[PDB]
Design a protein around this ligand. Sequence first.
Ligand SMILES: [Mg+2]
Ligand SMILES: [Mg+2]
Ligand SMILES: [Mg+2]
Ligand SMILES: [Mg+2]
Ligand SMILES: [Mg+2]
Ligand SMILES: [Mg+2]
Ligand SMILES: [Mg+2]
Ligand SMILES: [Mg+2]
Ligand SMILES: [Mg+2]
Ligand SMILES: [Mg+2]
Ligand SMILES: [Mg+2]
Ligand SMILES: [Mg+2]
Ligand SMILES: [Mg+2]
Ligand SMILES: [Mg+2]
Ligand SMILES: [Mg+2]
Ligand SMILES: [Mg+2]
Ligand SMILES: [Mg+2]
Ligand SMILES: [Mg+2]
Ligand SMILES: [Mg+2]
Ligand SMILES: [Mg+2]
Length: 181
Amino acid sequence: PLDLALKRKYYEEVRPELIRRFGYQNVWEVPRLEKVVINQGLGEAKEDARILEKAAQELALITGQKPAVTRAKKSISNFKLRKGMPIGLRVTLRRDRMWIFLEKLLNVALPRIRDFRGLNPNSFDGRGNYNLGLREQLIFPEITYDMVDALRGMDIAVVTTAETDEEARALLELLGFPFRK
RNA sequence: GGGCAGUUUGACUGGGGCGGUCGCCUCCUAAAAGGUAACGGAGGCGCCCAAAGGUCCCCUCAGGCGGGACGGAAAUCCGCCGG
Ligand SMILES: [Mg+2]
Ligand SMILES: [Mg+2]
Ligand SMILES: [Mg+2]
Ligand SMILES: [Mg+2]
Ligand SMILES: [Mg+2]
Ligand SMILES: [Mg+2]
Ligand SMILES: [Mg+2]
Ligand SMILES: [Mg+2]
Ligand SMILES: [Mg+2]
Ligand SMILES: [Mg+2]
Ligand SMILES: [Mg+2]
Ligand SMILES: [Mg+2]
Ligand SMILES: [Mg+2]
Ligand SMILES: [Mg+2]
Ligand SMILES: [Mg+2]
Ligand SMILES: [Mg+2]
Ligand SMILES: [Mg+2]
Ligand SMILES: [Mg+2]
Ligand SMILES: [Mg+2]
Ligand SMILES: [Mg+2]
């Protein structure tokens, strides 16, 4: 379904807007999203995959994609780790799914967040990319209360083509990133 | 069943006994081929695997810095450097 609200926002408003502050000589120099990634540090449930099939299908609902497990590399008995028996979930959503996802998060997820106040602006890692954590996961649409057996939040990475994050700072605000400023 | 009989009771060893050692692999001694001794300096083997094998196909580390709900020097995710 190559169409949606935010998908347009970037073109018929946000694309030229960027050219206003930086004036790119070329049509591609103008930064774009192209990679949204999500990861859950469930080393907590690394014991039994029992409490894991759930957070997977839960994650799948809110993202549309079928998540992919991530094994342990090292081994640390300091907290029950060895080989690859452990666990973590990772899902790389791009294309349309990325937009239909970012619409929910910026227009539904964030606002219903317990005592929200604005995304931390410092979370820009030199190059144009943003990261942020969420203690809960029920702050998503298609998640009912009686469904969650345990509150397990996570964090999402978003990747732009922006070289410097100075530019990136702008591209996010223009899409709908409520920065704490 | 030492009353009695026939015997055995290793070698190396700055004398012998005591101690230590005895076969195999790696490194140094070894003097830029090979080989090379000392009771010279240092360490391992007496197994393991039906996947830890065959072939076809695909992927590339450790580490460092920055950013990230548990995490917290170190779990998993993203970015940059890294032969
Ligand atoms: Mg007898
Ligand atoms: Mg007798
Ligand atoms: Mg003498
Ligand atoms: Mg002697
Ligand atoms: Mg004597
Ligand atoms: Mg002796
Ligand atoms: Mg030994
Ligand atoms: Mg092997
Ligand atoms: Mg490759
Ligand atoms: Mg260090
Ligand atoms: Mg760091
Ligand atoms: Mg950090
Ligand atoms: Mg870090
Ligand atoms: Mg953190
Ligand atoms: Mg927790
Ligand atoms: Mg500590
Ligand atoms: Mg850290
Ligand atoms: Mg990385
Ligand atoms: Mg970077
Ligand atoms: Mg090399």
